[PDB]
Structure formats: C-alpha cells, structure tokens
Design an enzyme around this catalytic site. Structure first.
Site, PDB file in Angstrom:
ATOM      1  N   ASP A  28      -6.623 -14.529   8.296  1.00 27.27           N
ATOM      2  CA  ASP A  28      -5.393 -14.384   7.507  1.00 27.27           C
ATOM      3  C   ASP A  28      -4.273 -15.312   7.997  1.00 27.27           C
ATOM      4  O   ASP A  28      -3.119 -14.900   8.143  1.00 27.27           O
ATOM      5  CB  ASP A  28      -4.900 -12.929   7.488  1.00 27.27           C
ATOM      6  CG  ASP A  28      -5.789 -12.006   6.657  1.00 27.27           C
ATOM      7  OD1 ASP A  28      -6.688 -12.494   5.950  1.00 27.27           O
ATOM      8  OD2 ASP A  28      -5.558 -10.779   6.681  1.00 27.27           O
ATOM      9  N   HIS A  60       0.855  -1.182   0.000  1.00 30.29           N
ATOM     10  CA  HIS A  60       0.000   0.000   0.000  1.00 30.29           C
ATOM     11  C   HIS A  60       0.888   1.228   0.000  1.00 30.29           C
ATOM     12  O   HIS A  60       1.986   1.199   0.557  1.00 30.29           O
ATOM     13  CB  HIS A  60      -0.874   0.097   1.257  1.00 30.29           C
ATOM     14  CG  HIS A  60      -1.770  -1.076   1.500  1.00 30.29           C
ATOM     15  ND1 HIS A  60      -1.342  -2.212   2.155  1.00 30.29           N
ATOM     16  CD2 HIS A  60      -3.086  -1.261   1.240  1.00 30.29           C
ATOM     17  CE1 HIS A  60      -2.349  -3.064   2.251  1.00 30.29           C
ATOM     18  NE2 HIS A  60      -3.420  -2.508   1.712  1.00 30.29           N
TER      19      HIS A  60
HETATM   20 MN    MN Z   1      -8.259 -11.366   4.838  1.00 30.26          MN
END
Ligand code: MN
Ligand code: MG
Ligand code: MG
Ligand code: MG
Ligand code: MG
Ligand code: MN
Ligand code: MN
Ligand code: MN
Lengths: 387, 387, 387, 387
Positions: A256, A53
């Site tokens: 995640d 990012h």
């Molecule tokens: Mn995720």
C-alpha cells in the site's frame, strides 16, 4: 505546479492517513487521528472526498446515542469543507469474531451477524450521500485445504450479496456494490482472488447489474498480473465502478505505498487508460504512509499520491497527442486491431481464398510490428525527454 | 500396485511425450516421435486416449494429399489400440506469422487466417470423435503497454469465439470449447490470464453455454493462485469442461513437470475435489519429460503422471471415509458452511434480534476453528501415517 | 539529444541483437546476423564494444582452419570500427551434451570437456583484448531433489574455477573472472542463484582476488530482490567486475527486455548508484529485442538501451545536485548513517549511560524520518517535474 | 507412533506458541501465555528446549528488580522440566524506536541503543546456557531507494557485529552468532535478504569464525529459492549453526505455518539433507499457530511440527537404505559427481586428448540421465507406496 483540485475527484479512506503504523512485527508509531482533523487536512490539500469503514468512524460496540454523536461531528466537518463521501464499506476483518470470515464464516451465526453489521452501515452510507458500497472480503478464505469447501463458500457468498441487493432494492437506495479483490493476506488464500474471479462471480448473482469491481493496483500485482490489462477487462464488461490507487513492489506482502511508487510504468499506462476511456468515478487512494513517518510525512505522502497522478495524466496526454506517436500507432496497426476481423460474416470468411488457400504466411510473418519504437516514444514522454 | 486402466480416463497430448527438449537456451535432446508410435506406447502404459494440435499430426504446409495419408495412419493406430481422441486443439503459436497473436493479432489478415486454420481442425476433430476443442491463446497479449489496446483485443477475441460457435452450431457439431488460461510466457502478459478472467469473458459471448475452461495446474500456480480453489469456482459455475494436470514449483517459467511433482499437497487437494465432485471428463496431462531424459525416461515420466494420480486418489478416499475425519469436519463446522445463511428471508433476518442486538460476539470469537487438527489428519492420510 | 558516445562504455553481446526470436513455443522470426554486420551497426549507434560466446563466433565443431577464418573476419571489423572486446564467455548450455551442466554435470567426462572448451576460448578472449571472462552456469542445477548433491556439485564448481585460475596465472594473462548468477531457467533451480550466493562461493576459491560477479538486472528481479541493493553489496565487497543491464517485469520467465523497461524506478536508483560510486567497467546490455520486431526494430531497441541509461544518468545527477534534495538528505539523517556507531570503542559504549540507562526511547521513537518527502523529490526529478 | 523425545532436539520459541494472533488487519484472538506455562506444556509434548527474545521473557521497561523475578521463575521452570535453552535473540523490531532499524538506523543514538540492548541479553543467554545467539534484522532496510545508502548500512552492520564479537571474546563466552536472513516484510526490502547474502557478509567480519547463518524455510521460499539447495551451500561453507523450520506457500507474506505444511516435497528433501549430513544442532520451529485456533489448536499445531519431521525422517531413511534407490543413484551417476574432475592436474587435463580433441560429444549427449525414474522412487518412498 500539478496542483490537485476537487474536480480531479481524488478521495482517501479515513484508514489511510489514519493508519497508526501497527504492522505484523511492530507497535503503532503514530497516534490516532480524529476523523474531523483528517477531513479538514485533506480538504486543504485539494481532495474531493473521503471514505470510511463503519469501525473507522463508530467505535466497535458503540451505543446508538454514542453512534449519533460520532456521526454528527463527522457530519459537520464535511459540511464545513464541502468534502463528499462517495463510497463507504464495512469492517468484516478486524474483530476476532471474523477470524474465519464474515459472509463465508463456517459458523452460521457469524454470517448472519456480518450481514446485519453490513446493512446498518449501508443506511449510514446512503445518508451521507455515498453512491458506491465496497466489499473487501479480507477474511474469506483459508490457510489449509480442508477448512473451507469453496463451492459451499461461494454459495454463501452469493447468498450474502443477493440479500444485500434485495435490501437496497426494497429501500429504493441509489447505491451500487463494488467487490474489492485480493489474492491473499491476511488469509493464506482469499476467495475471489483477482479482478477476473470477481467479474465471473458477479455474473451468477440474482441482479448482476447492481455489482461491479473495485480493483486495487497492489492487489493484482500481488499475483504478478498486469493491472492496466485487468482494468481494461473490467471496463470492457461495464463493471469498473470504483478504483483503488497505490503502489506495490511486485509479489510480496500488501505494501500500500503511495500511488506512483512501486511499478511506475504500470502507473503511466493505467492513467493513460482511465483518462482515454473517460472513467468518471473517484480516484481513491487506498494507501498507508510508511510507519517511518511523522504526521508531516503522512500529509506529504498523501499529497504525493495526487501529484503523481497529475504528472502521469499530463505525460499520457502529451504521448497521445504527439504526431510522431500518431504515425507510430498506425505503423504498429493499432487502428487495424479496432476493426472487425470478419464483418463480412462466417460464410464470406469460409469462401475467402485470401484468408487461407492463397494467404502468403511467409510474407505476413516478415512484417515487423514496430513495437519497440512505439514503446521508446512512450518512455521518452514519461521521462519528459520530449513534449 | 496403483496400475492405470483405460477406465481411469488418463489422456496425453502427442506434444507431451513427443517434446524433443528444445528450450530457450538449448537444442533438441531427443529425436521426433512418430504419432503412431506414441499412440501404441501410451496404450501399453494404460492410457485412455490422446490429444493433438493440428500441427502435431499433420506437418505444417502439408498438401491435401499428404494430409489424408497422415490421418489414415493415425485412425488405424487408434483402431488397433482402441485409444480415444477426447479433445483437439489448434497450434496458433509456433509459426512466426503468429508472433503478435492469432485471434488478436493487430493485422486483420493474420486474424482471418487464424480463424480459417482453426475451423479446418474443428472438422478433423469431429471426424475423430473429439468432444472438447481447446484454445490456448499463447500469443495473445503484449510485452509493452502501447502495443495492444486490450479493450479492442477483447472485442476481437469475442468476435473469434462467436464465429466459431456459429460454425459448430450451423454444422450440427456436438463439440464444446474450453479456454486454457495462462498468465504469461511466451508473451510478457497473456490475455485472459487466469481461470477467473476466462470465466468472466465467457459470460459475454453470444452463446455462453458452448464455452468452458481448461485450467492447467502449473498456469494458475504461475500467478501464485490456489489451483483447487480456482477449480472449485469453475465447478460452481458449471464450466469445468476439461483439465490439464502437471507440476510446477511456484512462480517462474512454465515447467510442465509430471503430475505430483511441484506442489504435492495442492495435487492432493485437487484430486480430492475432482473425485468428490464427480468430475467425469478426461484426466489430461499437459507435461514435458525433462530434456535430461532419454526415451526410457520419457515413458517412466508418463507412467509417473498416472501413478501419482492413483496414489492421491486412494489417500483422498481414505481421508473422506475416515470416521475420525468426519468428526473433525463437524468440529470445524464444515457442515454448517453448507447451510443457508438466511433461508428465512431478508425481513426475518432484520427482525432476528439474536443475529445482532443480542449477539454475544465475544463468546463467538472465543470458538476455536479446530483447523490445525483437521489438517494434520489430512497430512497423516496423504503420507499414510494412518489408515 | 541523449546521444551515446564510445566514452559511455556501452557494450552489447553478439547474441543480443543477434537473437533470432526462437523461444520455448515458437520458431525464429529473424534471420541470423553476420557478426561483422553487428559490429558495424553497433559502432554507428555509438557503442563502445561487443562481447561474445565462443559459439556465437565459431560454429560448434569448427576445424582449426575454419576457426581461423571466422576470427579473421571479426578481427577486421573491430579494427575498422575501433570497437573493443572487453568481455567474452563460453557457451556451456546450448549443445545437448550440456543438458545436465558443464562444470557440475554428473558425468565426469562432460566436466573435463567443459573445462577444455572454456580454456580454448580464454586464449581467444585474451588475444582480442578482453579484460573480463564471464561464466553463466545456466545448466548447473536440477529439476528434482535427488538428481544433484549440491555439496558435491559445489566441490566440482570450486574445482573448475580453481583450475581456471591456475591456467590464467600460469599463462600470465591479465584477465579476471565474473560469475553471472541466475535463480532458475532453463533448469528448475540453478546453483549460485543470486548475487549473494555467488559472492559467498568466491570466498572459498583458492585465489578469490581473481573472481567477481556479473549481476544482471532481470535475474535478481526474478527472485523478487532489490537489484540496486545487491549491486551495493557487490560494490561493498569489491567484487563488481562487470554488469548486465536489461529489464524484467517481476517474477516470471527471463524476459531480457531493453534497459529502462520493466522496473523503471529500480533502473533510476541503479544508475544513481553506479555513477555516484564511480563504477568504471562496461555498461553491458544482455537483452533480446522482442521477436515481434524486424531488424529495424532490433536497432531501435538497442539504441533505446543506451538512450534510457543516459536519460536516467541526467536525472540522477540533477537529483543529487538539487539544494532541496541536499537539505532533505540531512533531514533524513543520511549523513549520520555514514558515521561510525561506536568509534569510541566497546568499553566507552558500555559505560555510556546515554546509550541505554538514560536513553529516552519515546522521544527517539517520535522522530519522523522524512523519507516520503525525500522520495517524492526523487520522483519529481525522474519525471522531469523539476530541475 | 512417530512420538518425539528430547533426543530428537526439537525446540520452540516462546513467541511461537505464544503468538496471540495479531496480524496487520486484525486484533488478538488468544490471551497471552505465561512463559512458565509454555515451558511446561512444551515439555509434555516431547520438546527438547525453548528459545526467547529478551522481550518475550522480560516485559520491556522492567526494572532491574522486576527483571530478576522473571528470570528466576523461568530458571525454576526449566529445572523442573529439564528443558534446555539452546539459543536466544534480541527483539530489535517491535518497539517504535526501531522503525528505521536497530544496527542500521540512520540515527546514531538508536544504533548505540540497539547494541546495548543486545549485549545485555547476551549476558542473560550465557547464564541460561545458550550456545547460539540469533540476529534477525527485521527492520534493517528500506521502502524507498534514497532512504538508505546500502554501502553505509553494510558498514554499520559490520561495525555492530564486530563489536559483538569483541564483547563475547573479551568475556570468554563460548557462544556463536547466527544471522537469520529474510528478503522482505516488515520492510519493503531487508538487508542481507537470503542465505547467500548473509554468508557473503560474514566473510568480511573481523572474526568470521564466530558467525554463521540461521536460515528459515519460509524466508528463502519468499524469494522463490530452493531451501534444501541453500542449506547445502551453508553446510558446504561450514556455516549452518542453527535452523528455523516451518511452512510457506510460495511467494507472499511470511506465513510461518507449521513444519510440513506449505511445500511438502521440499520438507522431505530438507530432512534427507539434514539427517544425511549429520546436522547436530537444534531442530527449531519458528512458526505461528493460525489465529483461527484456540489453545487446543495451538498445542495440536506444535505437536504437528514434530510429527511431520519424524515421518519425513523415516521416509528419507527408507529412501536412502533402499537397494533399488542405490542402483538408481548409480544409474544417474551421482557417484561420479562425487569424483574429482581433474585430480591429475591442469597440465594433464590439457594433454588429455580424450577430453576434447577425440571426445565424442554426440555419444555423450545421447546418455539419458535417468532422473525421472529416480524421482519417482523418491515419490513412492515419501508417500509410502513402497518399503
Ligand atoms: Mn492493499
Ligand atoms: Mg483496497
Ligand atoms: Mg496446457
Ligand atoms: Mg546476463
Ligand atoms: Mg525465524
Ligand atoms: Mn504449462
Ligand atoms: Mn536474462
Ligand atoms: Mn518467518
């Protein structure tokens, strides 16, 4: 054994191994990594490249001179290691100004600001060689029913993506967009919540050829959906531009975990599909090393992502090459699924008595599909119980 | 009070009030209903019309002789009561021949049979005046990963729907198709599992204008999705051809509770959306009176579907008419959401220094959204704690 | 390779391989099996024994002479094969009389009938040598909030189980009870929905020592819970009397896939726990061969249940014996978890400055737990990537 | 209209209205609140009292000098407003030292520190007049299977709670403990994940009478469970010591919406149960005003919690007072559910031929339960479509 190489095209976001462990209920457990250290450590593990990012690399509100010095260090680290930057993205979710969204914020001035922040980072992505620009609209949505008119918000979302397609077309940039769906978190509901909704939305953009999807394992599973099935629909539509690999244990918060964890059989069928379809994009890990880990556990978790993909790739290839699996696929008529139902055409079908008037439905119903043997062969191959 | 009239366009499937109560763990608790009796009882309750699967009306295996008597009786009942038939559909899921699907069965002869069975009922639907033909592919999908190559299955599903579109256009029929998504049950995973997946698939058909969606409240909620949001995207795409109303308590087996039950605030926001968008189609109930009920409870449950719609319609209208709600909507900048982000164009946006270089992000971040006040007004209106 | 033997104590319900494939949306795809054929086929695959509901063996409403002939055939088949009957249970869910429950039906006469039906089959279970009597209260619950006062229903449930404990105590039967939890389906919500709720309920029975749990893999996963964790709590309380093994893909309808399918890593950790705890009860498969299968697929699915357990047992033992896993467990301080926190007692803890006044929280916080390496070793062992 | 008074016993955590808006993906949107200001604003809204974690009141690391000033200011604010402190709790989840748990951390020195931190705050809770001490073990649990032997972890959790019970009894404190379950988040799985698991665990403590549960609406709904049913089981066991009220939309991250939001009919049935059972404890809101809100929205959201409780209380009272509802309850045989099944005893039941030998099961099966009529009356009352 199962050693990753740059040719395997494994990539990592700076924010993955860089995650400091701050979660909704706890403070950070690890210090911040210099992006330069991340690039070097990942190169030594066998990674192909990194993604970022804007706010991972360039502190929010950096001056232009200050921006230049941050890029130059990252710069040199990529040059020294041969690491590529195949994808980049914009942070339109962390700063409080984005609390009601970026592209679909109710306030018009925030929407214009989000577009300008995005366009600046497209320039940087192209300079670093990125071929894909990802958008995850994590703040686009609502907690309550009246806060967001979804038809108006989809108008605003289409307007933003159309403007971005205009910009890259005007600049002649060789870059494509990929929308990353997520059903919820941090908003109560997020717009375009699944692969399917994103694919449908792309068809209403002014130049749909510029846009694809970046599906994530855990996000589709957060809706209880079959991730390999959704990837198959994206491939069928010609829209799998990028993919996020990780793990997720069912319907809960976005975990995640490292790839391989979560739903292991779904991971097997996903790798089987990607390799047999000849998917040639990056294998990107959007994961977070658990906050129980020190930095040595961070690199162990990242290495595990790559190792599990390679193990599953080996088992899937062995599965497809097994002569016994061969025969079992024919026994389950998978080759007949791949043949046209009515290549003779509509008129011929309507005049075929064997398709209706004289079709023996009871005999056809008695035929077993032999799916359970086929599936136990797949289990055996996954577990290394045959070769 | 809150009495339905045919002008409200409430419709019911024969299979809804006619459900005998057989579930996976139990035998029937109610005797079968004669279709003529259902039409008459539904008319007495204020319904606008009825819908049917081919096999609800005509017992499977009926001779061409017996098939004619069944339709004649039914047509007569329709005439006597007025009652309409706005939509019809095919049963491609009950008979064992469909255990691996209809349009996407691995066996080609089953796929041809499924098409012929469907085409016969399209002819009947048109003769009875139906304007929408619904397809719920309840058996299209899989329990295990190797049993179905989803890319081939989507080729076969497209082939099937393209052939149906060829048939209706060649006959000059003025009927449209509506795909009814569902994520799972009775298959482990069903193809086109949500509104978004079906919307995306339609855009790859040969004649996409002939096809829309028939979303069901409970089916999207079986994936934890926001049903009003998904309806909004269907409306935005011009694809809401029909709708199935019922109730569902979250992520579990498909309950098919009467409308209003399950998630009550989502029902409120749904009715607000349908009525404010001016949806003109049928308000169709795809529900099952619980098997605890006798026939008096069947009719009480059907009446409840209609009554709950009408209460919610009143409260949503009062909400939108309230000057204090209109104030709160402006306070939350819903009117600015409806404003183009950058009708001045890409170049103007890039030159607008107020959109980035001189944007005060901390002042913008400080603006409260006033969403909780707006939502409590919506609460108060739903519960009748204001007028 | 991975051949089951009777010593592995694998058992199957008559209703598992006997399932004819009738589901909520489809008719049966297989004919009914004679219980005698089931016993013989399962013996040849290496099973240890079989279990049954009264209604699996004895047609509902059979006369006593008619009951005797059914038992005598089953009888002889067990004698001929050496198959045991370690568990039996009552069908209090299929007949319409049980539509609002058996033990907690609102109607008092149905509750008395359910107890009498149960007591008759306890006699038969004991005659056939059963040591465990399972109760699955599949109809105990509600679709709507007012239909069932749960405090009153729990009174009725306690009363039923207390009466059953009285009966076996009065008869001197050597048999124990196991409650099988399920969160929902076929009722909207089922009483005692998880292992935890059942364990709590048992503590309020008049003789809790007679009652334990029969947890099922898929049922706990239907609530998104960690099945190995719940089994650990049942073992900790001394209450794991029996276990149902199968597979389930997350939060949806009760799939009853063969063991190994669904969540494969949870299956690995479950077998690791059962074997290292020395669980010596039956390994019972409560599963349903998918209705796509003919009878040859039924026996392949049943064999797969047994094979997957044996593969996972081998990988778990190799995991625990690996010297590298050894060290990794010490590195993650699993042996310290097994030591008392404060065997010095309360007064000593309060006077230990190293526990608070002088505890270095920042140094303790910096210690990594090394969980990710430990977990990748477990992954490697499951996948056969090391030995 | 619907105005709260201190007599309604509404209480709020300092951390609720004091939540600054930091979530996993975003920074704070609101400045920190002074505890004294929260107490005064809450009193102005009609609250009965406030609750606190040790670290909400006293900044972590405070010297014994600084700790005294903080409590003095707070005590003074309490006195000026009247406001009570009915319950307090320990923060054993924010600081990185607790990343693997407090009472069940693998490291023994962390476990001893967690106990000492808790015991200090029990002393403070008692000085402020708290009657209930809550424990939410938010960090007790695991992401991976080998990281935690759950049987050892339950030994350590029991050891911790037994030591706390020893402490309070040795000091003569008149405080009770309430375990707050949660299934997941921030750990992949949390120990004691539901009301049932915690109820079962309490029965194995040395002094079980000192311990009950503090169930939270959203936490049970994160497992898809029926919260009113779980509350009923806690009441039946005599263990509902405290309750956390809020809103949650199904199975996803823990939303902590204001009460009334989320699942509205479950909130209705909850208030019906609490009020009809005569629950006398605090009505405590564990909620977070959404981070879209400024401080005006914070207070509007808190007011909404109280208002929605009061509306639901009125409608549930009207429902139970309605002679037509009383009729419908008898028609559904709820009064017979409250009747002993067999107060005549085991032997009498066995000799009762009307309970089995001569029981007409088909006539009983034909009885409708009239549940849908009862439920629509409950609908009508909730929505104010009758009086
Ligand atoms: Mn995720
Ligand atoms: Mg991602
Ligand atoms: Mg439907
Ligand atoms: Mg079972
Ligand atoms: Mg709480
Ligand atoms: Mn449905
Ligand atoms: Mn099951
Ligand atoms: Mn919560």
């Amino acid at each position: 054994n199962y050693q990753p190489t740059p040719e395997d095209r494994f990539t990592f976001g700076l924010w993955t191994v860089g995650w400091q462990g701050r979660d909704p209920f706890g403070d950070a457990t690890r210090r911040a990594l210099d992006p330069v250290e991340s690039v070097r450590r990942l190169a030594e593990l066998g990674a192909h490249g990194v993604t970022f990012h804007d706010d991972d690399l360039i502190p929010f509100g950096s001056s232009d001179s200050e921006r230049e010095e941050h890029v130059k260090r990252f710069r040199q680290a990529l040059d020294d290691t041969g690491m590529k930057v195949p994808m980049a993205t914009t942070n339109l979710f962390t700063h409080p100004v984005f609390k009601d969204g970026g592209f679909t914020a109710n306030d018009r001035d925030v929407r214009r600001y989000a577009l300008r922040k995005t366009i600046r980072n497209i320039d940087l992505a192209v300079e670093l060689g990125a071929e894909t620009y990802v958008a995850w609209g994590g703040r686009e949505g609502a907690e309550s029913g009246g806060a967001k008119d979804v038809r108006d918000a989809l108008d605003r979302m289409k307007e933003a993506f159309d403007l971005l397609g205009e910009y890259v077309t005007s600049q002649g940039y060789d870059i494509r967009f990929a929308i990353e769906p997520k059903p919820n978190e941090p908003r109560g509901d997020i717009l375009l919540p699944t692969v399917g909704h994103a694919l449908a939305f792309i068809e209403r953009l002014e130049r749909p050829e510029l846009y694809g999807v970046n599906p994530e394992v855990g996000h589709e599973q957060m809706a209880g959906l079959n991730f390999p099935h959704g990837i198959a629909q994206a491939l069928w539509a010609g829209k799998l531009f990028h993919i996020d690999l990780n793990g997720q244990n069912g319907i809960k918060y976005d975990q995640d975990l490292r790839f391989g964890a979560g739903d292991l059989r779904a991971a097997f069928w996903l790798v089987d599909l990607l390799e047999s379809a000849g998917y040639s994009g990056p294998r990107h890990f959007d994961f977070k090393p658990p906050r129980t880990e020190d930095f040595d556990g961070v690199w162990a978790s990242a290495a595990g992502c790559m190792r599990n993909y390679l193990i599953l790739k080996e088992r899937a290839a062995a599965f497809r090459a097994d002569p016994e699996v061969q025969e079992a696929l024919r026994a389950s008529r998978l080759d007949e699924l791949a043949r046209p139902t009515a290549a003779d055409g509509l008129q011929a079908l309507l005049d075929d008595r064997s398709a209706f008037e004289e079709f023996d439905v009871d005999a056809a119903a008695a035929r077993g599909m032999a799916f359970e043997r086929l599936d136990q062969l797949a289990m055996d191959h996954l577990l290394g119980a045959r070769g």
